[PDB]
DNA sequence: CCCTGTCTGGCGTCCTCTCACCTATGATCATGACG
DNA sequence: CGTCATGATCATATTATTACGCCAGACAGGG
């Protein structure tokens, strides 16, 4: 079955793979993150409650006072979104917090407080998010963009190759906390182990192991095994486990049990280890040279002298053995220090250590942190407990503790946010294991190590920084005042909190201005994974590897939609199905392929769970049950594609559209384009402009409805029902009774957004697309937006294209367009410019906006009214007067030189106290009248719905067929009816009606207050006049058009109609492209799009022929059914036998300008299907029509390719780039011309052009190019007199900026001069 | 500079000089009223560090800032590097009598001429038109001539066709790589708003027509017209200076 | 300003309670070795007049 | 990747093949970005080191120039004599091998007719005057530069050649990239250079030098093959002989450095004391 | 090398318009070094004719009248 | 004094176009209202 | 008439780090 707007124009759909998971709501990152941020969240985390429970309770400097936390609450905003964008306020909500003050007594902090006080306090204004997913900061709609950064936890990197120039790789182990001090363990080419804290000075690593109160005996107990030597009657025998001897060449003949095992000069084989462990050999015999370099573990003391025999971690010599042998020790514990197995890294590290106990280690750490000051044991304890071991200054998140347990092979993924002793010891153990040769290092670009922050987490962090500044103020006013007399709003002030959150949302590196000229550009700017910003890398520094697609971007981050230029691969765009995990990583759906059958359950995999399993590719053929029809199937195991068996697979992809993003899944035939041209096509499809009447794509991907409905430019119905009143302003839906609340009678009113300014100076319009009396369903479009049509997404328009060289006018990439295109007004885009004029406050008095103006006459002032402001509707030229303004000297606002327009909307804002003039009172009466009429129509329309409910209830149960309309309509309650649900319902509707009456009274009073009041404004401004010009820019030689595949081009000549190549029917082609761009720039998808567009228009022409002849619905039903079946096993399977002879005529009314065809991305329409659809129309099979010429009237040889391509106009127009300057203004500090176009400036004759004129022999051209034309002021006035008198001659002089160089060098101690 | 809001976001130099004069006046007052023995030392350290912030900020240990993270600009940051007087103001300058627009093809040109709009040719060539007006006697002063060419009356297009005729312009593509990147043409007036540029010539600019933009300059003096005709004309440079290969290869 | 505390208290970690002091007079890692002479000399200073900035 | 892309753009590409194509494409785009970033700075440093050198005289008056020979990597001759000695003033006047007969005088610009007359007589090495061996104080004379490139005649007195030179080198920096025996092909006489050779017992010619360079002199004088010959290599031929095509004339071992001798006699050990100077390591699984 | 060959000149304006300006101006400050405009880029700085094309004939005239 | 490692200074394309942003917080003084 | 509270206007610089990389030349560490 189909929805009623899907019976208007049902898009033909090729495609073979039956879908199982539809496209999710495309704005779920922004909305879900900010819903996670601001919501009443119990059990502590996440949200604002995490900040308010981690920075509170503020306890004082031993004054026994404490400011603890209760709850919070956000009130309603004073301004809704529309008034906020008009006036210019933030769209914020006040953050009320309930704080409590308690004050303890003397001698008992575990005793009773004498007095508490709990109260409401005001702090900050956090800006809310609109339903589109955007913020309104100062009247300009802004987006905060998700950041891709390093995941907190341990990270074992390897500084490969480059250091020490000898190939010896290093290994470092960066512990990355979420908030606190970093910690980098590393090696050096002497194989010592060095710690460092926050990239500061370097210490040997075991100095922190003493700082955790470990003795050296315990350190060697941890980081090494033991070797036991027993002195038993002969040559100091040894306990030997032969696994340590795997490949070691002994120094003697190892024999045991009267049997020679190992010979001198040979090594111990593995089978000799098997012999020694099979015979269970324990004690072997060593020479005196064997313990010549063995390292003792613990301290041995002589019992008689009370001295030290040998210190810990010391090699043993002959005299040390002679001392400890005669003291009474039979057991000797040493360490195993092999070449391959276990290096003595800990032992060499302890030999570099000068420290000896806990205190000296804490002193040295306190000295490397803060240099050159007296340490004290209390200060060293406090610093080292506040580096890693305190809840305040150090905090891994849950993400950090998960990565730190997972990368150390733990079990519990839950732990504390602070470190401990076992954590650092496990980091050093894993680092030594990586140095020993077992285990692997971790790459950086792997998406199991890249977390995604969003709006909620970054706003929480900035709010937390505001709170630690305010706890740095409250720890102030709390123990330095008189108690009890103050309340907790005199202490805490809202300036740092609001300053921090307002600086983050106002100007950050990630809170950026929304590129809004297209529904696609909105919905793909909100889905952006930027690597830049705070905590990430920078553009002009890094690098190589991060600008490259890793093998685990498959289905998380789009590989082909990224901006080319200085930041490729850093401004990644997130894919279609890609959600965000609980912790912040990326996850993507798959289908659990149990042992034979592809089960239709979806199952979200992260980036590290994907690697262990094995995933089938998306388009693998399966026969109606899930059984894979091949016995070799293409899969990918561990980041590496291969060919696997039938039933060793564990997952299949969901749909074939999931590698790409929503920018580059509206490209039909994407699998035929080379990836560079698909990148340029997706980026230019983002850069489109909305035309006047947007049409549709004939060749789409079916993804248009998700991008249109799941954005916020169309007016989606909330509750379905029957339309009651359509208008260009408003739309009224009457809600069906099986969707309807019992109370609040309810018929909905959609106030559309008519002609208003976007951010890119386009024209964001909404047009109603429903008829009257028409049913609508829940979840359905009512009003099309900009670049939409019937709920689809129509960016550009589809035109008749031919690929042929035509007389050179399409030489490199140019485009040649018939005048039939510009006559139909079909690229005529509508732009809106906002021109502001402020009435400031200066000396000699304030300014005047009135029209009594000097130096002007009738010809200027005829287009102004009697109070200076231009009319609404006056079509002005470039350089007239819009607002007349004179200062205590003409300073009237003028149209900037070049642009026409029609003044559509004038706003006047008045700072309160200033006298409103007659036009400001006219606008006040106008908006009073509009708001009065609008709220009165709200009351009338909802009262009409309420009375219709009363009529619907009184059909039964005491019905009065004639007596109902004899009495006035406001008394439909006291009629004959007992105590039932109906009199209860009439009482509830009377409650609703009296609520509407008193609500209408109070809301009209509040709206008169909002219109009548002034507005807070800039320091020293009287009134602001804003005027909206509405230019209509058509098309001309110089604009940029482009298709959807990377075929760019400046349109080069707008030919007449007659010159166009026509065919043997009569129709001229509209646009003549260039064929030579196809074999080099390998975008072969545009030719398949051209042929399938010609097939679509062939079906449309046959419908137009079968309908223009007034044929009955039977033949239309026949032909539309044949055009909708037409293919292989497909998904569509429609039938017109359930459309009932009236929808088929209206569906053919919508198909007569062409039949829309969906072609999904990697499961598209093959060549034979295009041929069979070109055979259904009577077009030629090869797609090529023979074409005549317009000039000569004789045939082009070798018939050419025509069809329809869907081409977009880009907003790089030519009357926005063109500029010229004879003599304008000059800069102030260096007397050179200004830069730019708005400032009337000159083009920079840069350095390489100076080199290119030195490279010729042009000497006078360069002399006037940098002395006369540019800098020397007396030289250029002499030049201007000489040019207007006909004498071409220059008096050179000196550049004045060289005198500026002399003054800047001379302002140092340097004495530069000019000799002779 | 005023920011038109009642306040002056000052330049960094006045901040630096203001810091030196504050610290110096406080040091004069502390040497006046006697320094507390081993005391007249911290203030001189502060003065030395403020002067070292003024002459070259950031060369001594951690630099200063006004707002917020960015270190502010001393004198050596005005002479050195990019954004300084050697590379931004003295070796490459901003230049009057110049303009820029988007290029296009127009293959009906001879290779020594390029299309150029009527609006650009009227705004680049203004004082030539003023001179021809008060030399032919169609405006008494300069102000009547300026208002005539602002209204664009029906006679100034004949003046403009009489000043373009044998007068070269310099076309320039924005990444000039080698010396064929600046060439000189003789303009032809075009109804429209783009620069029609001969196709063969676009082998030397490495310029396609997918939105490229080129800038035109005007040689004012007489010797510069002769140098843009004899040395830099588009017919003269047909061989590259890298080898003997022709640069007019048909593309 | 002159302070006297370095026996076994917070040598350099907690300036005061809050307020906003510039620093600890810098001049090296620790404060300049202040001997027992200037302190006694600054026990009764300001023996001039109002002086001031004219 | 060991499993290639068996699908072209006229047919489809499925998802993994298009993903691997994306690996290649984004690697290329990032190469072009950072490539331009280095290329512009290379042009800057070259036009700032040259910057000053102006053709300021008309004849320096020296003779010593560099020797232009065609480059020989060891295969086909890559850059011939006509494309190197095109338009540059000769250092010493070229005498054809009819010795004491002058072919060109010693100050003649070698334009295209003279280059064809060089190619006909098969001239070995036209010694020619270079800019680096000039004599002009504070500048470069006109004759040592050569033809005015981009024009036909000799260089004009004045054209700044440092700037056009630095632009001509740095301008193709956008196009550049960023990140057993001797087998003969042709036939001719055999030349050896810097060789110390001796006769083995087999009758061949063995070599006692690393600095040996083999050359193939053709029928008219020049050289079409050159081969660096290693130390102790064994030739199947000698000097001045004649070979045929496809004939490997030399063989050696790239793994072993041969310590071959000159005189024929017994071998004894001098200053070779066992245990210290030489050690006893018996090859276990072979025997020798 | 070309960056050291360009920083080691007898003309401090060329070596100042190239890389580090601080070291070049301090060395030329304490040495009392005296540029004489010596070629192309110093004359591009100071605003006069290049001694390459037509300005080469002008500079031969100017140097001959010295 | 003769290496050999560390440290801190230099440097990292051109041209153009668009947009926002460029305090707020605390203390003191004056005026008005209430007792 | 006096005192207290509230509102408006005017006045200055932490508030209490970590994701570039190479080359090069001087300064110093180890022997
Ligand atoms: Mg291009
Ligand atoms: Zn010479």
PDB file of C-alpha atoms in Angstrom, chain A residues 116 177 459 725 1017 1024 1058 1064 1159 1180 1273:
ATOM      1  CA  UNK A 116      20.902  25.697  56.764  1.00  0.00           C
ATOM      2  CA  UNK A 177      43.690  10.820  30.734  1.00  0.00           C
ATOM      3  CA  UNK A 459      29.295  22.059  26.336  1.00  0.00           C
ATOM      4  CA  UNK A 725      -7.963  25.725   4.514  1.00  0.00           C
ATOM      5  CA  UNK A1017      20.865  47.587  21.824  1.00  0.00           C
ATOM      6  CA  UNK A1024      18.373  50.524  13.682  1.00  0.00           C
ATOM      7  CA  UNK A1058      17.820  28.547 -34.096  1.00  0.00           C
ATOM      8  CA  UNK A1064      14.575  14.794 -37.177  1.00  0.00           C
ATOM      9  CA  UNK A1159      18.669   4.123  -9.088  1.00  0.00           C
ATOM     10  CA  UNK A1180      16.879   4.318 -30.605  1.00  0.00           C
ATOM     11  CA  UNK A1273      51.093  59.824  -3.204  1.00  0.00           C
TER      12      UNK A1273
END
